Design an enzyme around this catalytic site. Structure first.
Site, PDB file in Angstrom:
ATOM      1  N   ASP A 150       0.806  -1.210   0.000  1.00  0.00           N
ATOM      2  CA  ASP A 150       0.000   0.000   0.000  1.00  0.00           C
ATOM      3  C   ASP A 150       0.839   1.259   0.000  1.00  0.00           C
ATOM      4  O   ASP A 150       2.024   1.217   0.286  1.00  0.00           O
ATOM      5  CB  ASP A 150      -0.968   0.005   1.178  1.00  0.00           C
ATOM      6  CG  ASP A 150      -0.332  -0.404   2.454  1.00  0.00           C
ATOM      7  OD1 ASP A 150       0.680  -1.102   2.408  1.00  0.00           O
ATOM      8  OD2 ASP A 150      -0.869  -0.066   3.515  1.00  0.00           O
ATOM      9  N   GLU A 158      -0.087  -1.981   5.650  1.00  0.00           N
ATOM     10  CA  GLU A 158       0.865  -1.625   6.699  1.00  0.00           C
ATOM     11  C   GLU A 158       0.558  -0.265   7.302  1.00  0.00           C
ATOM     12  O   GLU A 158       0.758  -0.045   8.482  1.00  0.00           O
ATOM     13  CB  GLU A 158       2.293  -1.656   6.177  1.00  0.00           C
ATOM     14  CG  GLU A 158       3.335  -1.321   7.221  1.00  0.00           C
ATOM     15  CD  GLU A 158       3.603   0.149   7.361  1.00  0.00           C
ATOM     16  OE1 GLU A 158       3.579   0.853   6.336  1.00  0.00           O
ATOM     17  OE2 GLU A 158       3.810   0.616   8.498  1.00  0.00           O
TER      18      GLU A 158
HETATM   19  O1  LIG Z   1       7.426   3.454   6.521  1.00  0.00           O
HETATM   20  C1  LIG Z   1       7.068   4.646   6.423  1.00  0.00           C
HETATM   21  O2  LIG Z   1       7.921   5.552   6.254  1.00  0.00           O
HETATM   22  C2  LIG Z   1       5.719   4.958   6.537  1.00  0.00           C
HETATM   23  C3  LIG Z   1       5.298   6.269   6.438  1.00  0.00           C
HETATM   24  C4  LIG Z   1       3.958   6.577   6.560  1.00  0.00           C
HETATM   25  N1  LIG Z   1       3.592   7.843   6.456  1.00  0.00           N
HETATM   26  O3  LIG Z   1       4.542   8.781   6.228  1.00  0.00           O
HETATM   27  O4  LIG Z   1       2.328   8.142   6.608  1.00  0.00           O
HETATM   28  C5  LIG Z   1       3.017   5.575   6.779  1.00  0.00           C
HETATM   29  C6  LIG Z   1       3.435   4.255   6.883  1.00  0.00           C
HETATM   30  C7  LIG Z   1       4.780   3.960   6.754  1.00  0.00           C
HETATM   31  O5  LIG Z   1       5.252   2.693   6.837  1.00  0.00           O
HETATM   32 MN   LIG Z   2       6.192   2.210   5.084  1.00  0.00          MN
END
Ligand SMILES: O=C(O)c1cc([N+](=O)[O-])ccc1O
Ligand SMILES: [Mn+2]
Ligand SMILES: O=C(O)c1cc([N+](=O)[O-])ccc1O
Ligand SMILES: O=C(O)c1cc([N+](=O)[O-])ccc1O
Lengths: 425, 212, 212
Positions: free
Chosen positions: A88, A158
């Site tokens: 995702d 995730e």
């Molecule tokens: O792994 C990430 O950097 C990450 C970042 C976001 N986000 O900036 O909203 C959400 C899920 C993530 O795994």
């Molecule tokens: Mn991520």
């Protein structure tokens, strides 16, 4: 240990797969796949793994939101290593309610200009996914000797989307149907490397989180021509007004929360933060009477050692100190973990990192230790797990990877496997 | 556990006689794997029995399902046949270790097989259980009349929802009236149900009036 | 063949150790029945081999399917388990005779089982085949060059549609090129297919010019 002379061969192969690495990331980053609609992205990865003979399985709760799990099987008698990234992406074109321009470009697309690859979908998270896909392809085609299996796990959901209130089921779930589901239904291994963007800094602590719905009560409802004025904010019959006061009290609590609950672990220093992610009350199509209630929605990160009930009581006290009546109700709880017994993976990675990157690894940046990543399910289930990839985090927010850096990560991934997967469990 | 054999043959061409383990019919080979797995299972529960503060865990093994191929097309025996195993774990056993043991049984027979996991869940012993333990003990002694005993092993060695709670940091135990349905008991005495409701209530009046 | 056992038990309660034939798990008992049935089958084909003018019939037996219970609910072993047997008959064997033989194998093991037939078809040797036999023979020697040989037993000991024709008074045989797919042959020579088509046509020109 890592092979002497078998590394150079695999490295050479990886040098020759550079454009294949690029196209895979771009094609993958190009797919519309925000949380809730990762189906198409899963389909791509499944047929990619299938073509390269990794015998993928679809492991999921719904037929259009699933994880993809394949293997590169070993000769026998070695440790298993998982490589993990998620399918995702953050922004949906739908989302005009959280972004000023929901339809930018960096939010949805992915392209190769200059020897960079741009796109949030690449930073998070198809860039790193491509890296270990390519690393696995290299290992396989170079006939690298591995006693243990390499498990290839691409997960859905995730990102911290969660259901709440009237938003239930298929369209709003994420992590409950993602990695932890995959691992619980076969995707197990001895160790696990989660490929997300840190900057070549390993992290093996991560944060938990509790989500609170805070509803403030007031009343009595009055037709606008009858509303009492003037009234002290905290006494207003309009719950919106009282909440406005609660909001700055909670922001003050938050400035201090993160400092009070900062905690240093071997796997990184956790700085657990707080944000108010949503507000509502009542409805926009019936505004002639102010609301008797108004709800707020809080993201509160936990360090691995904090009970969510402790945090709930702190928030309840903030409300109490203002003399307000409110319901503080949790609607999400997940634990964060520090890896136990991580040393073999830590060491395999450390050695590899120094061959490819050239210097010792440094201690990770705090936000990357203080978030949610899929190391938590692996560790929760007894698979020691860390995070490691190239580039800055999308939470930053970084918007690109250097191809040179991606080639490096894929190389580090391979060496790690050649070392680790030949150790005895 | 899927055993492979072959080559497939129309019934009038099946080679006989053939040693079981060499049979082209995977069902035939499977019968032989089933005996080996049954002996291994008898010993597993003893080898991995382990005593905890919360009870004694006796982890058992059962073969819960078998199939190959399909009942409506039987004129050629199957080249494969699958078995489905329930293998209970004590809180301290890595699932991969158990998989290796099952693969080893297969290997000892000279069979080609796939041993593939499709479920893994962890078991837990409660940590920091004392306050609940104590409230319950007290209520139990008032309503039932004598001290609590150590639980029967099957009730310690299954899946109950104490595991999700303990996994998520909520100290948790299990407690009720009657024999277990896996037993299988088929009734409750109403007097015993009433006793339990009393124990539950008293447990709540104690514990919920303690400071966290 | 459905073997019965029980009583059902949740995996943490399964009794061990127990003798295979006494197992509460019907899958376990069936595994023992399978090796007994395989030896019975080894002797069956020899005991019921029988020579006819149209060929030697070697009637074979295969276990074509097994199941019990369902793969998606394996926490309790099954109280029952079924096997599905393909048992070929020579034209002169009554199906009930075979059923009693199988009931007897089970009885020797002390097992409680249901042996239920769900298919019965008769095999036949052609009566009054000589006109077709001869017309074909003539054609065969012309195109292929030597007298015809006696057919291979598997091709006499199967089900082909000569049976319905024969059953209904239309004298009928089978004849074509190549090895049987049950073999398994996977190809034809184009030259042999052409030969056959010639034999078929020639056969027709002879036979269709006789007055009935
Ligand atoms: O792994 C990430 O950097 C990450 C970042 C976001 N986000 O900036 O909203 C959400 C899920 C993530 O795994
Ligand atoms: Mn991520
Ligand atoms: O609690 C039980 O005894 C129990 C039994 C079964 N079972 O016998 O299948 C399933 C769940 C249970 O909790
Ligand atoms: O004629 C055959 O060889 C034949 C073979 C099978 N089979 O191998 O299952 C079925 C029908 C046939 O006629």
């Amino acid at each position: 240990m890592a092979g002497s002379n078998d590394v150079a061969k695999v490295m050479k192969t990886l040098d020759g797969m550079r454009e294949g690495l690029i196209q895979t990331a771009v094609e993958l980053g190009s797919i519309e796949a925000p949380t809730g609609r990762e189906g198409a992205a899963g389909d791509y990865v499944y047929e990619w793994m299938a073509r390269n003979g990794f015998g993928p399985e679809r492991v999921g709760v719904f037929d259009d939101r699933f994880n993809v799990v394949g293997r590169l099987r070993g000769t026998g008698g070695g440790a298993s290593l998982s490589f993990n990234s998620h399918l995702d992406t953050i922004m949906a074109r739908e989302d005009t309610a959280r972004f000023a321009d929901a339809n930018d470009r960096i939010y949805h697309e992915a392209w190769h200009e200059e020897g960079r690859i741009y796109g949030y979908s690449v930073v998070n998270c198809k860039g790193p996914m491509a890296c270990w896909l390519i690393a696995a392809k290299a290992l396989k085609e170079a006939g690298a000797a591995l006693k243990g299996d390499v498990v290839l796990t691409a997960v859905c959901g995730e990102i911290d989307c969660e259901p709440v209130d009237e938003f239930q089921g298929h369209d709003y779930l994420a992590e409950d149907i993602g990695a932890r589901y995959a691992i619980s239904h076969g995707a197990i291994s001895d160790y696990a490397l989660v490929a997300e963007a840190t900057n070549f800094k390993p992290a093996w602590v991560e944060a938990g989180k509790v989500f609170l719905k805070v509803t403030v009560f007031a009343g009595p409802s009055r037709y606008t021509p009858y509303v009492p004025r003037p009234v002290a904010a905290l006494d207003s019959p309009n719950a919106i007004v009282r909440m406005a006061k609660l909001v700055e009290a909670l922001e003050e609590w938050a400035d201090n929360y993160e400092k009070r609950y900062t905690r240093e672990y071997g796997g990184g220093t956790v700085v657990p933060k707080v944000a108010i992610g949503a507000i509502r009350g009542g409805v926009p199509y019936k505004i002639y009477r102010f609301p008797e209630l108004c709800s707020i929605y809080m993201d509160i990160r936990l360090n691995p050692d904090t009970n969510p009930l402790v945090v709930q009581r702190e928030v309840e006290a903030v409300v109490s100190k203002l003399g307000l009546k409110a319901e503080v109700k949790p609607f999400l709880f997940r634990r964060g973990y520090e890896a136990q017994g991580i040393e073999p993976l830590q060491n395999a990675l450390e050695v590899a990192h120094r061959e490819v990157v050239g210097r010792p690894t440094e201690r990770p940046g705090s936000p990357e230790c203080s978030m949610w990543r899929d190391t938590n399910p692996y560790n929760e289930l007894g698979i020691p797990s860390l995070t490691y990839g190239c580039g800055g985090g999308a939470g930053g927010g970084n918007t690109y990877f250097l191809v040179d850096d991606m080639l490096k990560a894929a190389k580090v991934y391979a060496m790690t496997a050649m070392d680790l997967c030949n150790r005895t469990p």
